[PDB]
Amino acid sequence: MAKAAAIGIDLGTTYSCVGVFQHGKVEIIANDQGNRTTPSYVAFTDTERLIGDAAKNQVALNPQNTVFDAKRLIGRKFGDPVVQSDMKHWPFQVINDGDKPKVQVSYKGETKAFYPEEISSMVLTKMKEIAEAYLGYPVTNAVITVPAYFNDSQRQATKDAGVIAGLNVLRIINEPTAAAIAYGLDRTGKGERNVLIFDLGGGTFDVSILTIDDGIFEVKATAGDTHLGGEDFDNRLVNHFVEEFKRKHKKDISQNKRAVRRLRTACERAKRTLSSSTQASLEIDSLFEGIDFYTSITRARFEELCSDLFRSTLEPVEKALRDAKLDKAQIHDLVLVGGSTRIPKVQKLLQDFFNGRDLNKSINPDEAVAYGAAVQAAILIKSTR
């Protein structure tokens, strides 16, 4: 029953996703708000602890006590220059407990501090409860994914987050490996198969090259930008609309925190529409000083606004190829991961770089990692019996 069942969890930097393999198919499980992905956010309020959508929804009202980006801290020392650099950009406090970072917040009127693995365990607990509500019984066996560049300390702290969350961690697997499993790229028989995984998420960009030799995976190269993602494209749209509001009304809105956040969420929404329509409309009632902001933008203008950022995704692709010592024509498969890979200009740039090649994109790119983890979790629990 529950003991013969296992879930696959993509514990992402900005969003998490949970899947289950049963009756010959993967089911990506929708949360209680009907969303197939859940924000990796934890909010501490005057009455409760919120996780996911409810935590992301109140981030503007409670920024000091709304934790996100715990994956950037997990398994790291406080003194790590990555930690010291990131801390300058977070609205929540990060403290030092014997060279280990802890996030410090106010919860039910009291000061509390949490290890990154404790924060990530609250996200994992939510993914576990989402699966349990769908299945109708508690599932505890799980495969959890991590970036291919995570070291032993980061992998161990992720497994620790799983244990705190009440999960039996069958295995910690690499995200690009889970994505290749989702597409069944390890079941092509004999001979070395070179796979490139292009992973453009909400806040990070990762390029991974893998060789699959008779089911055995080997990481040949990892490249990317830890601070490039979908949110940079939302911000380019924001700056455009701030300049357009200034041209129409001769008013600078950039200082009004509420006006900027409402414009930001509307921009994120319009950006998504631009992946399937050639124009998107913004409809913001009383954006600033009672002035409605009803406008539109073409996909052509959006592509111009992010042109330099889209083009920059090809330097880590080339860098990964040189590190792996492979030419473009030596790559057998191209896999898309992360919601931002739905952007047509991004697909066109990657396809043209690989000389007109087909892309593996039929699985929802923000779900492919949880899909493969769910497949692996089923194989692993079946072998355990």
Ligand SMILES: Nc1ncnc2c1nc(Cl)n2[C@@H]1O[C@H](CO)[C@@H](O)[C@H]1O
């Ligand atoms: N249809 C889409 N077109 C463009 N960007 C998208 C789309 N869907 C998502 Cl999710 N994202 C973005 O992916 C990230 C999460 O993986 C977020 O930045 C989200 O906006």
